[PDB]
Amino acid sequence: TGIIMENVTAFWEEGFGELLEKSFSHLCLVGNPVLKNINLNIEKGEMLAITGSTGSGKTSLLMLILGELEASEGIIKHSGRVSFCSQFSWIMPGTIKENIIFGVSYDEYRYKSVVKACQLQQDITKFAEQDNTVLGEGGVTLSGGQRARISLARAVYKDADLYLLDSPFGYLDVFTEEQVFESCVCKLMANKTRILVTSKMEHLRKADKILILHQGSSYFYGTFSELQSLRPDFSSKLMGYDTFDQFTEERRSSILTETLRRFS
Ligand SMILES: Nc1ncnc2c1ncn2[C@@H]1O[C@H](COP(=O)(O)OP(=O)(O)OP(=O)(O)O)[C@@H](O)[C@H]1O
Ligand SMILES: [Mg+2]
User: Fold this and answer.
1) 55 is in an annotated binding site
2) Across the strands, what pairs with 214?
3) Backbone angles phi, psi at 223, to 5 degrees
4) Which positions bear Phosphoserine?
């Protein structure tokens, strides 16, 4: 399946705020849209890069696809299993391997292929028992990027038609993330429909389609080249840094926010 949204709007409802926490009642009382007039049309096998300002509705858009948020107006269409990799990297008690194949059946070629493309080999090779290493919930003594690669691997190992990847590339080990984006998202998953939330411009550059969000609104939908001509101010400033993508995630996101505020 591909995915289409035709003029979709979703309002704050009781619970969504608490769901997201993993005052809301005021937002629910005043009937405020969390997302307004969203359009997108992604074919089978394409990658959509979602970016925007902080708290612009990026995660909320994913929740709509998952059915955790209701589309009060408009048309959404997709079929098949979805696999969701949350910004929060959860880790269950058990080995690394058990965490990647959690609730699903081990297949040798599939496993090794996902391990390798998620750049996990460089990690497990530092441990005496490699992917048989036992973790506690939270996987608390690992780095953020290590937790995020195990969690991404878990999501990518699942056999689904649509992959939702919420901000996996947000940590300090920025060269590894560059390698993960190439080998996992661009190669291994080249023919899987996929939605990547991100604040790196390279990911926009390589995307089939682009969605920029600001304040629950679609600032821009289309291709990288349309961004460049249809949003010359935004693009000029964002392509203007020499290595924007190696800034911390907080800096990248604060530059996007400020830029979106400027050229609204
Ligand atoms: N942890 C939170 N505390 C208070 N409000 C929140 C929180 N998380 C989400 N919200 C609310 O939900 C709305 C949209 O949030 P959402 O998480 O979908 O945006 P986002 O683009 O994913 O944010 P971020 O840039 O931090 O990842 C915000 O306007 C805010 O009202
Ligand atoms: Mg988010």
Assistant:
1) yes
2) 217
3) -95, 165
4) 143, 254, 264
Q: What is the DSSP letter of 124?
A: H
Distance CA 63, CA 235 (A): 28
Q: Which two tokens stand for residue 126?
A: 């530092």
35, 180 contact by CB (below 8 A) = no
Nearest listed ligand to the Cα of residue 249: 1
Ligand 1 contacts CB of residue 151 (under 6 A): no
Question: 17 labelled as ligand-binding?
Answer: no
Tokens of 70: 């209701």
C-alpha 196/C-alpha 181 separation (Å) is 10
Contact (Cβ atoms closer than 8 angstroms) between residue 206 and residue 176? no
C-alpha to C-alpha distance for 131 and 95, rounded to whole angstroms: 7
Token representation of residue 45: 């096998």
- Tell me the ligand closest to 23's alpha carbon: 1
- Which residue is associated with the tokens 């999501």? 155
Name the residue ranges covered by the structural domains of the chain: 1-264
For 174, the token pair is 């920025």
For the domain bounded by 1-264, which CATH number is listed?
3.40.50.300
Distance of alpha carbon 39 from alpha carbon 217, whole angstroms: 10
> What resolution in angstroms, rounded to 1 decimal?
2.2
